[PDB]
Design a binder for these strands. Structure first.
Length: 174
RNA sequence: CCUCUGGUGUACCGGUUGUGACGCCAGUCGCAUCGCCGGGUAGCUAUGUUCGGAAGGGAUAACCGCUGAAAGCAUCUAAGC
């Protein structure tokens, strides 16, 4: 698989330690861990790493591709990290970051308080935008989805919480 | 469950008709659906009183996902959450 054949690059300050199944990546941003499928083997030569199958099975190639992708994600995350940029649209819709808990007012009869998990930080330049930053792409996406699920966009006006890079289908009555 | 509101309450109290008896008056008792009629203690009881189906964990159904290759893109799935 082309993804597996492609080699991943270690920038410099990040270290990759394989200990049997449980590979670990250390970096400036923090610590991450990744397990390896029984068909996959990893060879680190120079900063570069090679994912290749132990057996020539199609399943082994597929697992090698997914392993290369996840490790590339982990290395990029520890080196630099990611952010999400959620946006809020609607009249009276508001948000604020206080400590580790984000407070939202989305038109219900009670404010919503959402507790950020360990590893993700948030900040709001204004009331209608949220910036989530983290080293873990998967956890960052999960947190963004959970925050968006409190009030999803509607087609008639677009009110609600949306991704910055999100296309929203729109219609009208009659 | 029986404090309250009621029902029943033929061994509790009273009014009264006919007849027989207790020697007689007075006073009582038997029989007449408990003779008929008015009340009513405990117990039982509903139509009376009080209480219950509150809240919370765990795994899931349809459904909605996150990251992610096979298939350089895409994709809730094949690893994983």
């Amino acid at each position: 698989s082309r993804v597996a054949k492609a080699p991943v690059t270690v920038p410099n300050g990040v270290t990759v330690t394989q200990n049997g199944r449980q590979v670990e990546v250390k970096g400036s941003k923090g610590t991450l861990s990744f397990n390896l499928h029984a068909l996959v083997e990893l060879k680190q030569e120079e900063g570069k790493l090679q994912l290749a199958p132990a057996k020539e099975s199609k399943d082994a190639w597929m697992q090698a591709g997914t392993a290369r992708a996840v490790l590339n994600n982990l290395v990029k995350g520890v080196s630099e990290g990611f952010e999400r940029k959620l946006q809020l649209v609607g009249v009276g819709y508001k948000a604020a970051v206080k400590g580790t808990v984000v407070n939202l007012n989305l038109g219900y009869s009670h404010p919503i308080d959402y507790a950020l998990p360990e590893g993700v930080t948030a900040e709001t330049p204004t009331a209608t935008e949220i910036i989530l930053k983290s080293a873990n792409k998967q956890l960052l996406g999960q947190v963004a989805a959970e925050i968006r699920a409190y009030r999803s966009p509607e087609p008639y006006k677009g009110k609600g919480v949306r991704y910055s890079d999100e296309v929203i289908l729109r219609k009208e009555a009659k």
